[PDB]
Structure formats: structure tokens, C-alpha cells
Nucleic acid binder design. Sequence first.
RNA 1: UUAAUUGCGAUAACGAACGAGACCUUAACCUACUAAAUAGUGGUGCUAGCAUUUGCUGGUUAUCCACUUCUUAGAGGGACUAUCGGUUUCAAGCCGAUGGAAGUUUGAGGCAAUAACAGGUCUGUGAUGCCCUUAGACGUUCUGGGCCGCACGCGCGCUACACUGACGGAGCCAGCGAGUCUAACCUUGGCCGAGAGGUCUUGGUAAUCUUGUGAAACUCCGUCGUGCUGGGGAUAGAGCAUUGUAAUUAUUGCUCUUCAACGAGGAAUUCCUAGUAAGCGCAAGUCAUCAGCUUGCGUUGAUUACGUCCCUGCCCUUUGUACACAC
Lengths: 82, 143, 206, 63, 145, 141, 100, 56, 63
Amino acid sequence: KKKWSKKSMKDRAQHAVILDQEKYDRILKEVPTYRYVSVSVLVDRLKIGGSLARIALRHLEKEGIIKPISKHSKQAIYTRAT
Amino acid sequence: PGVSVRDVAAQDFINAYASFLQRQGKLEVPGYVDIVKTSSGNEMPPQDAEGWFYKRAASVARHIYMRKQVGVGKLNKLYGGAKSRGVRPYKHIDASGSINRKVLQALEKIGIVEISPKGGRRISENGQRDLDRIAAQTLEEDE
Amino acid sequence: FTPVVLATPIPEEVQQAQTEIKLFNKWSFEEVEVKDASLVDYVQVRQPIFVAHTAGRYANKRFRKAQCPIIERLTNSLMMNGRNNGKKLKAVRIIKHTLDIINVLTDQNPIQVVVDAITNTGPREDTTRVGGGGAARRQAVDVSPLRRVNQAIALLTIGAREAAFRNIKTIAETLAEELINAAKGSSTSYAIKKKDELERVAKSNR
Amino acid sequence: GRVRTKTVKRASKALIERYYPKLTLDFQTNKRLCDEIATIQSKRLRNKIAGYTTHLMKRIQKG
Amino acid sequence: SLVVQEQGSFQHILRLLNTNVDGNIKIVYALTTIKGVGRRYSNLVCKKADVDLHKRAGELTQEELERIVQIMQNPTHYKIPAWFLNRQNDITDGKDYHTLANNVESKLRDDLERLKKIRAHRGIRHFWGLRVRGQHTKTTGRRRA
Amino acid sequence: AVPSVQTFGKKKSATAVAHVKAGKGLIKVNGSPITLVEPEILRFKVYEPLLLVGLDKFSNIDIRVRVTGGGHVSQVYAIRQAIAKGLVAYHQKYVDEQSKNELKKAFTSYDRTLLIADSRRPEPKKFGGKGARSRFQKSYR
Amino acid sequence: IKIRITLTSTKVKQLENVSSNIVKNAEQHNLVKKGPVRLPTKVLKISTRKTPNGEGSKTWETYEMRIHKRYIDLEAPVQIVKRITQITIEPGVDVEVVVA
Amino acid sequence: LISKKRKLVADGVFYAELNEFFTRELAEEGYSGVEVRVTPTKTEVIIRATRTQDVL
Amino acid sequence: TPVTLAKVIKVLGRTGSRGGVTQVRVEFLEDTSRTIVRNVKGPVRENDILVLMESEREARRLR
RNA sequence: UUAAUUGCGAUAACGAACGAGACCUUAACCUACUAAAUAGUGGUGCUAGCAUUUGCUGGUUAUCCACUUCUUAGAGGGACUAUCGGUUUCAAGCCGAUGGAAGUUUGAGGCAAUAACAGGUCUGUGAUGCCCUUAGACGUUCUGGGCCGCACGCGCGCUACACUGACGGAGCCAGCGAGUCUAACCUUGGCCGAGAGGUCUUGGUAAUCUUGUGAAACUCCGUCGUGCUGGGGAUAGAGCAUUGUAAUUAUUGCUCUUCAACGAGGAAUUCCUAGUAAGCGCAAGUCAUCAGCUUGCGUUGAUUACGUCCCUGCCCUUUGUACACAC
């Protein structure tokens, strides 16, 4: 039969689902200088699963560097304190 | 001032109530929890598996209290919802009257609820006072 | 200002918004003067609203959509592509998130920078068809201010929409970055690139 | 669209023919006298007739 | 907010019942990726295993895993209600079984060719490749044969 | 006796009837205050009138409202129209015509909808289609 | 005595002159009553095709039967009761009374 | 005992069926139409027509 | 990109073979009293400002 | 000029009629009349909780008192383009603005002319002409299959192709409308069962009870993570109930398991200008059971025009014609 499609490949991203001390102090030193912060920011700049991203957002707004301003579900919005 | 469920919000209150009951531990959960999907349509069971019986209980207590008299039929029509019949279009479907009967009977055991004529169940005055006091606790907890 | 109390206590930020000045939830619709004396009279400001939703019967007459609040038009443009017909509530939610994103960024008025973006990406000359008979040809012509408005909002919405399709970067944040791109002039926003491409072919087939 | 038929126009013409003094420019009283002075089987039709009659009385008052 | 660094205890891959399984995922959906088992039974037996569902697979113990598969291959010992199972009241014993990665297709072929040899309608439909469940077959679904 | 009135606000199919009187500055809806409406933005949308006029006009006044019909948003628009209409009724009744007319003037200059209700009643269905205008589909071959 | 009279008809003006002579009879004899409890009117709708056969275009007709129902609760002794019953029998309209 | 809906429609089809009967059999007698008037313990059928003694 | 801001003062009428465009008289604001007659695509009205990427054209017609 | 052979008028025409319009229904407005536990409101008393301070939130048909704004229905009113400003032989009328519930014939329908098709239907009709058949009948009845059979092509529709999301929890609001009598409809309650479902009861011939149909979508929270992956659910297997004399090519439903194409659709093509499209689910019709069908109902609710005849076709007039079962 016929397909009428192309169906090519992509990067097949390898976002992390666990971490190490290197990734940990990386994000600790890297989350600043981010006037805008979000799950996708963490993902693309740190190559992490969204579960890691959400939990780390919770962790960092708990310890206090990132100042949230809106805690709506499906979208977490933070600045950093400075 | 006087306090009431209508005065306080819904979901945070229900969270607090189910947490209070989960801490009290005197609910006498059936035992087949962590098995069922709560319906014929919910394509999976819940996620806070150890919980959600207490949330269900708190919510139905709130609901009957706002209301007067209900039945498990009404509760199923309330708590069920959409089913994916595969390719075929969606449909509303009624939840597990057995689950609702069991939580109702748990509430009858603790005495928060009271079987009520003209059909159904109803909030008792002990439930009334502890409900208003939990509302006080929540509207103090937020600060 | 006086913080007034009632039998029912109210939050003080909203009491302040009442007593002081009409706003968004936060933002001030004033000091959003646009630079284009062409696009004035076909935008809508100085009619502030807290929410970006109301069912104003604007599309009954011709230019009452010009008198419509612009951000309402943005929401109404955002809800499309079928499955998201309606869902104006999630539209205004996304607006809320985007505007907060812009203002944590570009810390001037995000309302101001979005209006600067749409007037940045306004298409001014277009092309149009002549049939011929046997063969079709083009001819470049001018554009309405209202049409600039509609084309720009459509452009932004659709670029951010396809940016959000089948990827993790949500529509809110891709929309915000698209808007500031169009604001400054980026060579990265769908809207401006399509605009000057179209005006370029118009210039060509003048 | 907002055009009116010949039964309407001729009725208005006849009433202005033989009741010009008894009536005036006011839609309301023209309606409330039309109702009795000309048997009319339709309220909306009476209203249309009244409107046209005041149109024509204005014409007479200017020309 | 809980953040902790996964060390060599983690493993990107493992093996369960003639099948390689992926870490870096929710364990229950790893189980569903294994055959003969879906979300219901996977979630159920993970609860019976008394272990975190939130946690991934690679950072787990062989005692956990052998307890899990022990549940899977002797569930009725572990108090399963005897209606979750994908094979209730088997024809030869009347016992309610759960078929797994290989046994599913094995016993499938078994009862299918059984029908075929007793010359049943369903058997011959399965044989020729027609539709078995009383479908309409004229118009739709020509692209499987 | 009491200074009290009883008015409403209509919508597509949503009717929000409000009883208003002299009280202590309380607002309730189904026995629940205004802060528990829960579309989470339409809370501000329904605050709009009383914020426009300031809470000074709500100091010693009690409102209790009860609503039915149609969607959440329809209930909401019915509510804000009902309370605006009822406040204007109260100020027609007890307060001066001056306060009444300036009040409605502010409300209207914000929006005509706050007092007058959207009379766009829904169109019926016809045969030939799934709706009021959309026919089904043409086929020829 | 506590009767309830009711009418269950479609011919509106018939029903209404019936109700009018009813109520004026009741009030000239000076008997207690409630008003004419006017129920919501019920429209029986039948929606089908115009075409007897199957062909031609599709076209639907909607026939209607409009029903109006009224009732009042009354008290009156038996002689006035039965005179009221044996009077005010207007055709087309359907009537029935009950007690207790 | 039965609902007033089916009561009324049964009265309607009753009228229709007897009208069919009568426009069939009294057809050569100058028939035009008929009218039941409901009554307690009675129901009555005028036949508007021309050839009166003939239908009698 | 030196453009000229000029205002439609008259609409001549609709053109395109499909009513999709129009012809309008437009006065330049800079160098006032310098008129032009030109085309427009979108919805437009009287008194209406508009940017023009040139001054020196008057397309008579189109199909 | 009009939506209009609708009007102004022009005029070997005058006066009329049909169609349209008019008319009918429904949708919207009425704090004005008639009113009412088969609809509500408030208050009184009885009574629960918190506050207690006065109150707030509630339950209470025989606790009653009063009212009818919501609710119904009845009679009625109301908008006729009112006014104003331009435009127009300055006439019909057109545009804008104000006010107004409503200012595209207010909206949508119904009704819907003369002539005509060698349109469809003799399978709706005990309406049917003519022919055929009429007893091993083409009549009727009984059984079992059949109308679904699949190598393939076309038309309606439902599902999706995922974050404007899926799943699990919570909040969780409608309307149209149907219902048992000599039958067994709608069924509430409460008991059992994971569920389908079963159970013994209850109310209802109906604004009364089913039902406030506590519908869905939605919204708030979390799990997920861009992965033909928790998308999607055909395909199949096993088990469990129900409908029906009978379920076998599984009726339908519930549970577990198997989880395929599909990554937005090519030449082409459909519908559509306002609460309309579209999304959403809901009742009724068929009906013992079976909705992806239809008719209706409501819920959330956009963008894009206010034009043109370019394509496809329509109306009037003029013209040409070797056309008349008529390009």
C-alpha cells in the first residue's frame, strides 16, 4: 500500500533520570544568572527529566535561591534572588 | 465569628480532614484497598494508594453536610464520569456503589454520619461540631 | 488609600487594586502608548480590565473588533486548531503565565513590549492575484492597519503554537520569547520573518 | 429591508386624507387612535401604519 | 524537594523472564513493557512487593525482584482475588492462571490449533486470517492480508 | 421593618437571585462567601463592580445569593449582574437618585453587561446539519 | 370538604371561559378557593419525515399537541358541590375532580 | 388511571377512526363531519350532514 | 526604510475580481495637499492613517 | 430603491387577484394586573453547629404568617426603525449616532403561487387499473440459514496522531424530554458483589417520584515526560453478568492479558459570518437487549469579511440563433 509520509529520525534525547554530584553542583552554580527559570529551562540547559526538574525546583525554592511567583500546575515560574 | 464549611475552601480542607483521619487511624479501612479503579471507567487505580479512601470519605462528608440526604446512586453519578469506550465516543458512567457503601458504613461506625429517613444518610451533630472545628483549624493553619 | 474591612475579610492586594487604580491582576494598562500613529485607532488600550475575558459582541459589526480589548483578541486567537476550540479559561491562564514571564523578563511593561512587538511585525504591503485566463499573475498592494493587527496576532499565535507542538517547551514560554523577539527585532520570530519575506516579494512584484 | 407595502402606504394616505386635523405628529397618540378609527387585525401592522403616517405628516409640515 | 545522587547501584538495563528491561523509568511501566502483564497487575504486585513506585528500576535489589517474580508465578499464594488473571478456569484443570512472556503465546497457539483440529468456526477464521469476533469484513480492514 | 430588596441576574440559562438588605458588610453565595467561586480568575471578574465603586458602598450591607442554570461562567455573569442590579435597587430605594444614576453610570461606562444582560439567546437546530447553520457534507459520486 | 378540581385540555379559550364561569360561580356563592393553579404547558412533539417512501431529499416535520392543565383546591358542602359539578360541562375540555 | 397524554391521543384517534367509519358508510348520505361532546356518564355524536332521515 | 505616513481621505470603491481590495484617495501628511490614489487590501474606513512604502504610484485598476 | 414586480414614480394603459410581505409559533423585556406547597422567596415557631454579642451556616409540611422578583402560565403592553445628524429626484429610501431588552424584513422556523418532471414510491395504505399467480400457490404458517458473507473502489461518521496533553484525585453547574393497569415503564432507598449486576423495598399516570437528572467538557491539585512512550486502542485469548425460546459468525456490558497502523495527510473536495462555526456531552425516535445514526436539547465558545461576480449557478432586460424530445 501507500504511505504519503516520510517518518525520519531525530536526536532521541537522553534527558537524565538520575544525577551525580557533578550534575548537582552544576545545577547549584548554573541556576543563577537566569532571570527566567522553568522546567524547560532546566531541561534544555541541564538535560534532565521533568521529574528531576520539578523536584529540583521544589528543592531550590525550599532552600531559597529561586523565588517563585506562580505555583500553577503544569507551569512553575521562578526568578532568582539577587 | 462562627465558622462553617461554606466559609472555608474545599480542597485544602478535604486534604486536612483526610490527613486528620489518617492520623487518627480509627477509620477501619475495608482491606481490598489498593486493588480497584473506583469505577468501570477509570483506566487505572489511584496514585496515593495508601490514601484516597480518607479523601473520598472527607469529600462525601462535606457533600452530604452541604446537602441533607443522598444515596450511593447519587454518589456514583457524582464521582464517576467519562469512559473511553475505545474508538467509540465518550460516556458518563457511575462509580462503585460498593466503595461508597463501605465508606458510608465506616462513617456510620464512627458516628459522624447518621442514616436519615426519606431515604439516605445525613450529617450528625457530632460530625457538625468536629467539621466546624476542623474548619477553624484550617483557617488558622493557613497563617 | 485606606485599607477598609468588611464583615467578610478581603485580601489587601485586591482591596488596594479596588481603592487605588484599575489594573490587570498586577499590571497598569497606562504608560503603554504605542509608537505607530497608523496602528493607533486600531488597537485598544486605556479600557483596562483585570481579566482578559468577556463575551463582548464585537464581531457583529465591522470595526467593533477594533474596539475590542486587544488581549481578549489574543486569547480568542490562541483558542483554535480544533481540539482547543473554546477553553478560553486555559487561554487566559496561558496569558497570565506568559505575562508574568515577560515581566520577570524585560522588566518594563510586558503589555508595552507586546504592543511594540505587534507593531514591529505589522505587514505593510502584500500581494494579490489576477486571474488572467490560462495563467495567473501577482500584483503588490497596500495593507489595512486592522489587517496588520490581525495578521500579526495570527502570526505570533501560530508560530508559538507550532513551536509548542510535540515538544517540551510549553506554549506560554515559547510565546513569551517569540513576543520579545518580535519586540526587539530578532530575525528569529516567525512573525517578523514571514512579514518581511512577504513584503519583500511584494516589493519584487511591484 | 425597512420598506413598507402599498396597503400600508394607501391606508396611511387615506387616514391623512380624512383625519388630518384629528391627528398629529406623535406616534403614540396616532397609534392609540389608529386602533379604534381603523379596524386593524394586527398590532405590529398598526405600528407600521402609525410610523408611516407620522412620516407623511412631517412631510406635510415641511412641504 | 528531595534530591539524592544515584550511584553504581543504578543500572541502565536488566533482565526479567527472557526480556531486557529499561531503567530510568517508572518500575510499574517497565513491568507493563514486559509481556503478559499490564498496568493493573504491575501496580498491584508492586504494592504487594511493598516497595516505592515513585522510584525507578535500576536502583533495586535482586531480593526485591525475585520476591516480585515469586508473586507473579505464585500469585494466589500472595492473595490475589482470582479475577485479575489473564487465564481464569483453564480448560484442562479449571485453575485460574496468569500466562507470561512466553507462555502467553504458547498456550494461545495451543488452544487456537486445538480449535483448528476440532474444526471450529473460530479456528478456521483464525487460520484463514479472517475476522473472528463477528465483525463486518467486506469494506473495512483489507490491509492485514 | 427591614430595608431589603430581592433582584436577580440572568444569562444564557443562568439565574442568580440575590437578597440584599442592611447588614454589616457581608457577601454570601449558597451560604458561602464571595472568595469561593472557583474558576480562580472569575473571582476577580465578579469583584469588578464593587472594586470599581469602592468597598465604601458595602460597609453595613448584607447580600445573600443563590444561583442555578448552565455553566460556571454563565452563573458568574448572572451573579455580577444580579449584585449590581440589586445594589442599584437598594440605592433607588433608600439612597438618592443621584447615587443611583452615578453608580449605574460608572457600571455602564465599564460595561453595558453589568446591568443589561446578553440577550443573544441560542439558535435552534435544523435538519440538514449538526447545528443551526452547519449542514452535514456534500457527496456526489 | 377539600376537593381538587382539574382540567386537562388543549382548547385554550374553551378551558378559560370554563374557568371563568367556574370561579365567578364559586365567588358569587362565596366559597373559599385557591386560584387557578396553571401548570406548565406540555407540548407533545412528533418529529419524522414528510416523505412516505425513502427517496427525495431529507426533510423533517414536527407536529405538536399543546396541552394546558389547570387545577384548584376547594371546600364547599355537597349541594353546591354537585350543582357545580353538573354545571360547567363545556365540550372539548377534559375535567375531573377528586376529594381528600 | 392512565396518563392524560395517552388519554388525549386515544380520544384523538378515537375521533379519527369513527370519522373514517362514518365518512365511509354515510358517504352517500351527505356526510360532512361529527362531534363527540364528552359528558359525565355519556358521550354524544352529532353528525353534520344533509340526508338526515336517511342516516336515521 | 524611509516610508511615508499618509491618510485615506476618500474611498473610491472596491476592486479585485473578487471584491477583495479597494481604491482610495490618500493625502500625504508630510508635504500636505500632496494627494495620491492607491489600493488597499484590508478593512478600512475614512480618516484612516496608513504607512506607505512609497509615494510615487497610482494603480488604476485590477482584476 | 428594495431581501422582494417591495416602493417612488414613468407610462396605451386602467383596475384587480395569487405569490412575497402580511399571518402563525418559538426565543428574548415586563419587580405592572390574575394568581399558586404539583414552583419558589422571606419571616415566624421546633431544632443542629460555630460563635456566642446581636449573628452566620443549616434541617424541620401541617409549625404556621405574608409575598410572587426568580418559577410558571393568561390577558396585555412593548420597537414602528422612535429621536437626532448627514445623504438622496431630496421621493421612495440609505448610512451613522443616542436612547432602548431588542434597530441585518429583532432572530429562527412554519405557511408557503402558476406551469412542470414522461423525478421517487404500486414494499405505508382493505387506494390501486392491466398482466401474472391462486392449493406439490408467488397466499399463510413451521424449522434452519440469509440479508453482515471479502480479492478490491467509492460516501457518510467515530477514534486518535499528546503537553492548549494522558492518567489519578478533589471541586463539580444545565436544559429539551419520556415514563406501570389490567401492564409490568421510570425506577429512589438500603443489603451483597471490584464491576457489570443481583437483591428485598419505596414513589410516580406526573411541574408532583424517578431528577437539582450532582451530564460531559471543564476548572484546582498532583504522576508523567517528547520517548509509535502512561499517545491511541483496532487486533486477538481467557473469565464474569445481563437481555431474549434461542446468542454459535463473540448481542451488549464488566475484569485481566496481547497493544497494530497513525507522527497533521496528495491530487481534489465539503460546511460556514454569530452565541453561528467548532468542541462538549445530554434526552427522545428506533427498542426485549444493542449507538459510532438521526431529530431535538442545552454547556464552553473563536478567528476571519460587511465585499465581488473570477470560478460554479440564479433573476430581469437588450441582442443573435440553422435551437424546441430545446448546447
